Amino acid sequence: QIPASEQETLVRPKPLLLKLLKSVGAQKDTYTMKEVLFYLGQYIMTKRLYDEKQQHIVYCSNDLLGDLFGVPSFSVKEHRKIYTMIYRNLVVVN
Numbered sequence: 001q002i003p004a005s006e007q008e009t010l011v012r013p014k015p016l017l018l019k020l021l022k023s024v025g026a027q028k029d030t031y032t033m034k035e036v037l038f039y040l041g042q043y044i045m046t047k048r049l050y051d052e053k054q055q056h057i058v059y060c061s062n063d064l065l066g067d068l069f070g071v072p073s074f075s076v077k078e079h080r081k082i083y084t085m086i087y088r089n090l091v092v093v094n
């Protein structure tokens with residue numbers, strides 16, 4: 001699905017994404033995609049937003065994550081879709 005270089009992309013989160021990131025990690029201006037991806041992963045895991053009997057599906061209809069991504073649920077295996085959902089919440093910097 002994804003090239004390995006993608007995680008090196010330098011990004012500046014939009015306000016809503018930054019709000020979420022600050023609840024799981026230190027506040028800075030610029031992140032790598034690897035960092036954004038990790039913090040979002042930890043947010044999901046700590047808040048237990050996944051189905052216990054169906055661990056590939058994240059449910060976020062009752063969470064700010066749902067507002068960020070614009071979906072009630074998604075699969076952790078759908079990597080291309082996740083990248084698209086994240087990208088709409090940031091500006092790439094070069």
Ligand SMILES: COc1ncc(-c2nc3c(n2C(C)C)[C@H](c2ccc(Cl)cc2C)N(c2cc(Cl)ccc2C)C3=O)c(OC)n1
Nearest residue numbers: 037038040041042044045050055058076077079080082083
């Ligand atoms: C309960 O057991 C359990 N174990 C494991 C998982 C679990 N599976 C994956 C991820 N997780 C966690 C950290 C949420 C993780 C992931 C999912 C959603 C988001 Cl926004 C962000 C991340 C970082 N990701 C993934 C997604 C992309 Cl685009 C690229 C690379 C990876 C590795 C996965 O494939 C998981 O997901 C809820 N549950």
Ligand SMILES: [Cl-]
Nearest residue numbers: 062063064065
């Ligand atoms: Cl929330």
